């Protein structure tokens, strides 16, 4: 038969989900950043835990070991590129100091809200899912899209979108036709 | 002995 | 003094309470300091607002200068 | 009399002409095909005579003359027919100019001894404001906002203009009659620069919405939009091939676009006064790159707001050579007006010595295609001519022309005469204010007019 | 307007042909038929339509290419 | 000693003019001396940018006094014609302010300059 296609889970249930502090924290995160449900928070927590565990394991190693240098340099490069880690902040110890919030701001929905294309996180999500936002030349309809530093400042309304230059949507032209009639 | 030295271009048309 | 007059400008200084106080105020504020006695006076309102800024402009020349001159108030 | 025989006859006549003009014949034929090989082949900096240039200034009624574009017929070797649109226009030179007064004007510059002569003009106004308010409906015949730029099609059949009205209007050269209006279709898509691909109908448009738009004038349609610049693309240049180059203003990044390859090369200045001062043991940091002209298909030059003229090579990301404060330092502000203090010495301290001094901007910069000489412009009151080294690694100041007084919004060069003996005419648009906006303080003696300088070849 | 672009062109005398990747830019248009593209490629390459083949065309997400 | 003090160097001015341009696009920039006066009164400003070549200079020396009273960093740039160009307005600008917004997309860049400007003072 055909060779297997590997797969993996991108999230894990926290250790004891029902902590009142944890429930309030998820409430705050979801409200501030307009997350649909708790699975998004669990996913990003899983990713952050993986990253921070890797950073800890590398930190355990002595300074100047080949594996520590190579893996740490790669991890710092990726974190700096994605934008969670600032340029002046390039050390594994500071990787241990990251939080989920940083990745949350790096979401495309949050960037669209902050840039002023949308006045609210929910409005930003609605715009993303309706194909009105383009990163560079590419239309992106995934709110969980992770925006790089370079890609950050190319976010714009898509050329095909009515807000980005194209003809008015069906509602507008329907209303115009009925008014004409 | 030295190896052999290394050695069609894109073309464009617009219509309509 | 040269822009508006010795009597009128002095009232503005007293109305603000001090030449330092008057300089710190925004132009819109300076207009309503002298709006009770009609010191600075639709077309009429525009000149009053216009003069109010210049009055604010001239006051700054005076307050923060150790030896203010009248060259700027003249051209203003 | 088959068509091939016709080509023979023209070529046979063409070869006889070269023989009459004149080893020499073989070299000239190679020179005729030096253009396709994207390398400099016009080394005429030394034989220029700048001191003997006949300079003249012609006043124009329009306010703030924004740009100028010159059209020159060229004989096509492949078909041996002149680029002139019609027989009447055989060997006629035209120059098109735009201003902030919403007026397009064409002049005849054929007679180098004589001043430019107006032929026709078209003026826009509030009559052309679109009522719809929708971007796709901005298809009015005339302009209603400031026109910033103009470009002449190499075929001599159309002239295209653009500005803050976010429209691209293409006009008939003969009557300046609009034939097509192409909206940019973006809210902030204000056109800032146009460059025609040499000997082609392709047009490259730089818009304030951070994108470059490509058009086919023959089809009167848009082709592609280019993305990657991080700030407004103020300037655009183009040569025979499709490799156009741009500058990103505050981005301080110059980008070359390989349109066929859909790839782009990034170049950045990266100069720091601290290292510059140390290596020396006034140096101003680059703020923005405003002008660009491509000397060669593998080289280009850029001008910044710190008065820096930098030479670039496609191989190297960093500048290969730089000329700092090319046009000098701006006059120091007067002491009698810096402050209102009566005592003079108080006023002098406000000048803070020489710290407040700032350099001239390189408002205009043009290089003749595939040559070793280019011209720079500013409001210093003189045009400076620079010659590039034979190795294409450095350039020097060839000379200066002081006739121009005002902001040199754009520069153009035209040539006439025999191949060996060529007369060059330098046409530069002069305005009292910078093209993009009114930041610049009024310059004493500045006037709105077209500056003309005619330079000869002797040796 | 529609732009047709050929890249990664490899001459294959073993099969006596030209292999290449086709990029089609079609703003404001759904897509271009294989027939029309064969016409334009044939004209560009100065070869018979019958000698031109095209396949495996996928429209990129968001359209226009 | 000079009335315009501190005066930023070329490197600092470049970084400042970079931030102000970004703040202009994001609607976080108030332009004009009168605006800079108001924003200080409402306490919604991060720092005030000022032109040392302003004609005459004193006319914006009330902004430093309000700033030092309210503990707002302030700096002088050599050129007003340059400052206006960065702001995006078609006229020279002598004074400018950055509006307070912890939820702005350029918070890090603003604070980076807000650190250095403080060191300059
Ligand atoms: Mg759609």
PDB file of C-alpha atoms in Angstrom, chain E:
ATOM      1  CA  UNK E   1      -5.352  41.783 -20.293  1.00  0.00           C
ATOM      2  CA  UNK E   2      -3.769  38.337 -19.985  1.00  0.00           C
ATOM      3  CA  UNK E   3      -0.034  37.720 -19.624  1.00  0.00           C
ATOM      4  CA  UNK E   4       1.631  34.405 -20.511  1.00  0.00           C
ATOM      5  CA  UNK E   5       5.080  33.684 -19.106  1.00  0.00           C
ATOM      6  CA  UNK E   6       7.441  30.753 -19.687  1.00  0.00           C
ATOM      7  CA  UNK E   7      10.113  29.768 -17.171  1.00  0.00           C
ATOM      8  CA  UNK E   8      12.544  26.944 -16.406  1.00  0.00           C
ATOM      9  CA  UNK E   9      12.708  26.204 -20.126  1.00  0.00           C
ATOM     10  CA  UNK E  10      14.676  23.028 -20.879  1.00  0.00           C
ATOM     11  CA  UNK E  11      15.449  21.774 -24.373  1.00  0.00           C
ATOM     12  CA  UNK E  12      14.980  17.995 -24.648  1.00  0.00           C
ATOM     13  CA  UNK E  13      16.328  16.709 -27.982  1.00  0.00           C
ATOM     14  CA  UNK E  14      15.808  13.177 -26.655  1.00  0.00           C
ATOM     15  CA  UNK E  15      12.070  13.839 -26.977  1.00  0.00           C
ATOM     16  CA  UNK E  16      12.726  16.653 -29.474  1.00  0.00           C
ATOM     17  CA  UNK E  17      10.768  19.274 -27.580  1.00  0.00           C
ATOM     18  CA  UNK E  18      10.751  22.233 -25.205  1.00  0.00           C
ATOM     19  CA  UNK E  19       9.644  21.671 -21.593  1.00  0.00           C
ATOM     20  CA  UNK E  20       8.719  24.641 -19.433  1.00  0.00           C
ATOM     21  CA  UNK E  21       6.512  26.072 -16.686  1.00  0.00           C
ATOM     22  CA  UNK E  22       3.611  28.329 -17.676  1.00  0.00           C
ATOM     23  CA  UNK E  23       2.586  31.263 -15.485  1.00  0.00           C
ATOM     24  CA  UNK E  24      -0.698  32.886 -16.519  1.00  0.00           C
ATOM     25  CA  UNK E  25      -1.679  36.277 -15.107  1.00  0.00           C
ATOM     26  CA  UNK E  26      -5.397  36.885 -15.706  1.00  0.00           C
ATOM     27  CA  UNK E  27      -6.670  39.839 -13.656  1.00  0.00           C
ATOM     28  CA  UNK E  28     -10.454  40.254 -13.565  1.00  0.00           C
ATOM     29  CA  UNK E  29     -10.872  36.887 -15.302  1.00  0.00           C
ATOM     30  CA  UNK E  30     -11.726  33.433 -13.998  1.00  0.00           C
ATOM     31  CA  UNK E  31      -9.044  31.599 -15.999  1.00  0.00           C
ATOM     32  CA  UNK E  32      -7.825  30.935 -19.553  1.00  0.00           C
ATOM     33  CA  UNK E  33      -8.828  27.910 -21.612  1.00  0.00           C
ATOM     34  CA  UNK E  34      -6.175  25.415 -22.654  1.00  0.00           C
ATOM     35  CA  UNK E  35      -7.118  26.083 -26.280  1.00  0.00           C
ATOM     36  CA  UNK E  36      -6.452  29.833 -26.176  1.00  0.00           C
ATOM     37  CA  UNK E  37      -3.206  29.288 -24.292  1.00  0.00           C
ATOM     38  CA  UNK E  38      -2.149  26.797 -26.947  1.00  0.00           C
ATOM     39  CA  UNK E  39      -2.831  29.450 -29.591  1.00  0.00           C
ATOM     40  CA  UNK E  40      -0.709  32.031 -27.807  1.00  0.00           C
ATOM     41  CA  UNK E  41       2.147  29.634 -27.036  1.00  0.00           C
ATOM     42  CA  UNK E  42       2.132  28.471 -30.655  1.00  0.00           C
ATOM     43  CA  UNK E  43       2.364  32.060 -31.873  1.00  0.00           C
ATOM     44  CA  UNK E  44       5.123  32.897 -29.382  1.00  0.00           C
ATOM     45  CA  UNK E  45       7.215  29.833 -30.227  1.00  0.00           C
ATOM     46  CA  UNK E  46       6.544  30.117 -33.982  1.00  0.00           C
ATOM     47  CA  UNK E  47       5.308  26.519 -34.061  1.00  0.00           C
ATOM     48  CA  UNK E  48       2.114  24.739 -35.041  1.00  0.00           C
ATOM     49  CA  UNK E  49      -0.726  24.672 -32.547  1.00  0.00           C
ATOM     50  CA  UNK E  50      -0.707  20.904 -32.994  1.00  0.00           C
ATOM     51  CA  UNK E  51       2.845  20.756 -31.613  1.00  0.00           C
ATOM     52  CA  UNK E  52       1.954  22.652 -28.402  1.00  0.00           C
ATOM     53  CA  UNK E  53       0.601  20.832 -25.342  1.00  0.00           C
ATOM     54  CA  UNK E  54      -0.367  22.268 -21.952  1.00  0.00           C
ATOM     55  CA  UNK E  55      -1.615  20.619 -18.783  1.00  0.00           C
ATOM     56  CA  UNK E  56      -1.668  20.561 -15.003  1.00  0.00           C
ATOM     57  CA  UNK E  57      -2.905  24.133 -14.597  1.00  0.00           C
ATOM     58  CA  UNK E  58      -3.948  25.157 -11.087  1.00  0.00           C
ATOM     59  CA  UNK E  59      -5.385  28.538 -10.169  1.00  0.00           C
ATOM     60  CA  UNK E  60      -3.617  29.996  -7.158  1.00  0.00           C
ATOM     61  CA  UNK E  61      -5.714  30.692  -4.070  1.00  0.00           C
ATOM     62  CA  UNK E  62      -7.348  34.099  -4.274  1.00  0.00           C
ATOM     63  CA  UNK E  63      -7.432  34.023  -8.067  1.00  0.00           C
ATOM     64  CA  UNK E  64      -5.685  36.116 -10.665  1.00  0.00           C
ATOM     65  CA  UNK E  65      -2.873  33.655 -11.387  1.00  0.00           C
TER      66      UNK E  65
END
